[PDB]
From a paper:
Human Cx31.3/GJC3, which is expressed in oligodendrocytes of the central nervous systems, does not form intercellular channels. We also found that the hemichannel has a pore with a diameter of ~8 Å and selectively transports chloride ions.
Six NTHs in the hemichannel are placed at the cytoplasmic entrance, whereas those in GJIChs are at the inner surface of the pore. With this structure, we analyzed the solvent-accessible pore diameters along the pore axis and found that NTHs form the smallest pore with a diameter of ~8 Å, which is smaller than those of Cx26 (10 Å) and Cx46/50 (11 Å) GJICh structures. A strong density blob is located next to R144 in a deep hydrophilic pocket at the boundary of cytoplasmic and transmembrane regions, which spatially fit well at the head group of phosphatidylethanolamine (PE). In our putative PE-bound model, the phospho and amino groups of PE interact with the guanidino group of R144 and the carboxyl group of E13, respectively. In the Ca2+-free state, the tunnel is occupied by six water molecules (W1 to W6) with clear map densities, which form an extensive interaction network with the tunnel-lining residues. Therefore, we propose that the entrance-covering NTH conformation represents a partially closed state of Cx31.3 hemichannel, which would prevent the movement of metabolites through and selectively allows small anions to pass through the hemichannel.
Numbering used by the authors:
A (entry chain B), B (entry chain A), C (entry chain F), D (entry chain E), E (entry chain D), F (entry chain C): 2 to 107, 127 to 221
């Protein structure tokens, strides 16, 4: 109902600044729409785009497995669903609070909702920071055009060629930047609540 | 209606702790979204990724059938729909209880809803535990890179090679962990209701 | 409207037991979700999985047509839409009954709704039983690994090989069991209404 | 709104029998669901299932074009959207009648709705009958297994083979039967309104 | 809301005849459903259905580009979205008129809605007429079975063959007829408002 | 709720002209529908439509990467989601303004909504203008039919041929025109608010 949805939206964002109320939800929606609309077109065919110059049985599959143990499409899907877990717990906690206080009326509980809001921002700051570090460790900042392989069952060292290294590099840097701004604005919303006044005190 | 949906949500979760009210529904939704979004991309092409070094008619199909009698994608779909059966029976039982007590007013029946809640948690604990044991028995904890085959109509013993063993191993361990936490938090919600006070008494 | 939907649900299930109110709708939904999610992955490629050892023009297509005149995917889709026809007629009959008695108020007609409920269960019992018998007659209980063919325009007798006979056998036995329980619980709901007191009297 | 939708459903079916109120809408929905769920799987690959024994340039395409100038999938889609045109005109005429009589109150116009109901049944009887005759003229009652071709630019007479003639024949006879019952029950609903008392008088 | 949607539908069609209120919206919906359901199946594979008898590098692509600079699927999508632009402007103009006159009450503005209705019909008449003329200029009334090509980098003159010319011709004539009736009934709705009394006066 | 949605639409467009209220939203919706319906059919297969006359390993992929570092489909998706970011921030700012002034009543804040409306139009003018300049710099106004390549690991200079250059050129000019009108009508809506009276004063 409108009267109910209108009271729920005012309670979920009563102790937030505009950074947490407007800017963060739009940035996270931007990231998801970009991944769903453009992701499969850039990285979906990476296996048939990895051509090695050989005919020995089993050497091609051994070299591709050593180059990419995990696809970026699978990495990014895990990041967006894990980062959504603290927000879904907080929104469910807020819904049951509004239900079990409507029948009563329709302080001690207002201070419980603030501690839950600080806890999910802190968890999102830790999860977002670990993901950026893993992305740099797994993929770097560029996709090369060739790759040298000396994995068994290959005889000697073989050269393999990759397709579309420019478009894949452009998409990798864009995702780093979009996630980097999500981390900065999560950190800033904790400062405007008083993270500074807690550290040195 | 809001007034009706608001009374239904307060009745379905009146004798639950936060583990059953918030944590379990989010974990089960996480598992389903991960399977639908990433499952086909990891395991969808497993048949054409199984290359055997032979030309005898019918030996390739006999070796693949001996390696995997059932695909993990089919196994995991069965697990999530079977585990949802006790919850759908409980939510339907609760809906008809609220309907046939609204026209009256709008004790003996409050104690019937508690026994139904304990029964579906116990059934989910048994179904979830059997699935984890079968997953380990069928697949183990890793996917190998080669496989030796001596099944008829093959002459001698042939070697077959598999593609992407690292990404398939990573996904198999992730699904074991997500299901393992679902089992732990189902067991804990039965303890907080008084499973301990029933066993030794 | 809630007040209207709430009166409709209480009328459609006023003379039903819990077997007809909870258990049957969940079993029928389980069957449909399993067919839509897993069916195409097991049986969708059966035509290119039927390899015959020959080069004569037209012999391959003649042997596949003699092996499977109808695919199980087409058989099962027909079964689930035919079994839904009696239930859709009953739910429409109930909706117009509630509409043409709201404007009046908002016995003779309560006894018309009971006879319509008994008639659609009896029709579903006949349709479900005929489908199980046809499934056994068309497919049996297992899918073989080879098949011998002496159909024109083949010269002599040729051997053809099939892929994935284990996974196809597992899925065929699962669908027989799910449909078998639907038949048992339709028969039991007619007994709890008084089928026994009508036969010998 | 419920109060509005409830008055609209009682006006659209105030001068109908149960044949027009329950049986016809379910039969037409059955036909559409069967076409969308099973149609592409039976007839979607008919072009690559038409193998001719030749290498002359352009003879294969000339023989397939002489065999099927129109696919059954395209024929059946046209039939279901054309038959829905009289019903959509009638339901729109009824909606504006209820709107322009609510503000007034909320005879001469009740007799206008009856003449519109008789006119759309008569149009559907003519369109449904013409479609059945064209289906028999274009396709017959069976799909053959071979086809002889003497069309230019073929040198001589060549034989072409078709795949899956049994499953295509089964689906063609099923669609004839489903449409045949739609025609019978449209004709019967005009008789129960008084078509008999108009012909001989 | 029903009370709001009910007042909006009576204002958008208060100065229309049944041609503009019922017949035109059904014809335009018919065209869109036919294009989405059957279009890709007839014209989606036109590039691989254009076989030329040559091996020179680049001659095949030069001949197909000279035959079809624009696909009918792209032409028809542009026609239906362009023709919908005047109707979307009119329906938005009507919505804001009803909103900014509800708070007041809930003549000079009734005459503004009539001039806007005449302007969008006139724009649709011009856009629909230009599309029919371009369709005849680009495609004609039939698709041939062969095509002769003397475009560079081809050496000499080569013959190319097309697949399914009968089904493509049938679909092209059907789309001309459906659009031709849309133009006639747009012209007739302007005459019934008084286009005749404006021309000679 | 209707009463709430009706007050929200009147506040979001209380200081707009018809250019911003009707014309701009329809033009932006037109662009998105054209990209989703026709984009993949024109540019989806550009990689297999780039045929080079060579057999050296790795020369084909090096030449395609030098021709197109970024696909137009990826460029246009980024443009439409970036241009939607200022509008989503403004509509969220307006929703919370209406909520936190309903409970009060149900000047200083009316002047805050005007400054936010001017700021998102100015941001959209800068983003739209930069996109048009980049589109001309990356792609020009036409797609050629051939391309000469002297990139390593190619030996000498090779010629590569492209398919369908006419249809790709037609679509590129259409997207430039649709975006050009979006820029003009964003600039005009700032002039009708008083951009002229601010520049020289
Ligand atoms: C109004 C005036 C405005 C002026 C604007 C100036 C701005 C310049 C833009 C630069 C940019 C923007 C990308 C779009 C990002 C959008 C973000 C949204 C993304 C959506 C999610 C594209 O710009 C390129 O466009 C080319 C078009 O062909 C132009 O080519 C010239 O002109 C043509 C004319 O037609 C001629 O035809 C053509 O012959 C000319 O060569 C160049 O100007 C330019 O390189 C990116 O530059 C790119 O350069 C390449 C070069 O190597 C980089 O490759 C790297 O090195 C390779 C070898 O080591 C590796 O192999 C590769 O792996 C690696 O990557 C890329 O990485 C990237 O840095
Ligand atoms: C800010 C500092 C932070 C530091 C972080 C340290 C953490 C280290 C992470 C480790 C991890 C995380 C996977 C992501 C899980 C995400 C969960 C979400 C999943 C979404 C659902 C990927 O890390 C790998 O990344 C490689 C990238 O190429 C790196 O390669 C090096 O550096 C490159 C540099 O570029 C160079 O290019 C490259 O030459 C270097 O070799 C290595 O560092 C590392 O192996 C998993 O390790 C993996 O190792 C492989 C090795 O064998 C395992 O293979 C197993 O053995 C094979 C042979 O028996 C079998 O054949 C295979 O079948 C079997 O499996 C895998 O099983 C797995 O254990
Ligand atoms: C915690 C302890 C718990 C212990 C649990 C014990 C329970 C045992 C389960 C048994 C079951 C469950 C299927 C899942 C059903 C789920 C229902 C949901 C379905 C979703 C809709 C799979 O179990 C199999 O798993 C194998 C895994 O490879 C194991 O192989 C071994 O260990 C591996 C180790 O890794 C080694 O690698 C491997 O070398 C070992 O060989 C075996 O243990 C076993 O055969 C079905 O058994 C199956 O057996 C095969 C054999 O022939 C049947 O084939 C039939 O005969 C062929 C020749 O005539 C025909 O050609 C074929 O056509 C026909 O069919 C199948 O029909 C089916 O009966
Ligand atoms: C509880 C007891 C209950 C007893 C029930 C008795 C009822 C019998 C049913 C009969 C029916 C039902 C189809 C399902 C319709 C469902 C409607 C819903 C459809 C969903 C939209 C399938 O039944 C077939 O099933 C076979 C299974 O293989 C059986 O084969 C035997 O047993 C196997 C055992 O395993 C053995 O393996 C196998 O070796 C045995 O040969 C046969 O019994 C039978 O032919 C249709 O019969 C079909 O026959 C074929 C023969 O030619 C017709 O082909 C026609 O002629 C060809 C040559 O001119 C042309 O080339 C072809 O073009 C043309 O068509 C078909 O047209 C059709 O008439
Ligand atoms: C109850 C009695 C009722 C009697 C009804 C009489 C009505 C006759 C209908 C006629 C119609 C309706 C199409 C359906 C339109 C539906 C609209 C909805 C569309 C959905 C969006 C199909 O009718 C055809 O059906 C054939 C079936 O095979 C019949 O073939 C015979 O009988 C078979 C028996 O089985 C035998 O097997 C078979 O050997 C016999 O040859 C013929 O009767 C007839 O040609 C269209 O006719 C078509 O003719 C072809 C001939 O050339 C035209 O080709 C043109 O010329 C080529 C060479 O220059 C070019 O190459 C081609 O490019 C060009 O096009 C087509 O253009 C079109 O005009
Ligand atoms: C009622 C009277 C009304 C009269 C109307 C007059 C208007 C004329 C329209 C002109 C237009 C409209 C495109 C539709 C735009 C719709 C916008 C919506 C788009 C949806 C998003 C299509 O018109 C073409 O149609 C041809 C049909 O085949 C006609 O061909 C003749 O007649 C046939 C008869 O059948 C005969 O068969 C056929 O043999 C005849 O040759 C010609 O008339 C004409 O070229 C575009 O013209 C196009 O010309 C080509 C030529 O080169 C241009 O190619 C360029 O050069 C190449 C070589 O350098 C490059 O290789 C290429 O890369 C480059 O591009 C294109 O770029 C484009 O400019």
């Amino acid at each position: 109902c409108g009267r109910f949805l209108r009271r729920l939206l005012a309670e979920e964002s009563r102790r937030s600044t505009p950074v947490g109320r407007l800017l963060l939800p739009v940035l996270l929606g931007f990231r998801l729409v970009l991944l769903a609309a453009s992701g499969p077109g850039v990285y979906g065919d990476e296996q048939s785009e990895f051509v090695c110059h050989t005919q020995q049985p089993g050497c091609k599959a051994a070299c591709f497995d050593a180059f990419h143990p995990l696809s970026p499409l699978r990495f990014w899907v895990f990041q967006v669903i894990l980062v959504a877990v603290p927000s879904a717990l907080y929104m469910g906690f807020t819904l049951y609070h509004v239900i079990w206080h409507w029948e009563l009326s329709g302080g001690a509980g207002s201070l419980r909702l603030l501690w839950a809001y600080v806890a999910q921002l802190g968890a999102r700051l830790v999860l977002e920071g670990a993901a950026l570090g893993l992305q740099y460790h797994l993929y770097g900042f560029q996709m090369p055009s060739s790759f040298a392989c000396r994995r068994e069952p290959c005889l000697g060292s073989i050269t393999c060629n990759l397709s579309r290294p420019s478009e894949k590099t452009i998409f990798l840097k864009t995702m780093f930047g979009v996630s980097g701004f999500c981390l900065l604005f999560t950190f800033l919303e904790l400062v405007l609540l008083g993270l500074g006044r807690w550290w040195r005190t």
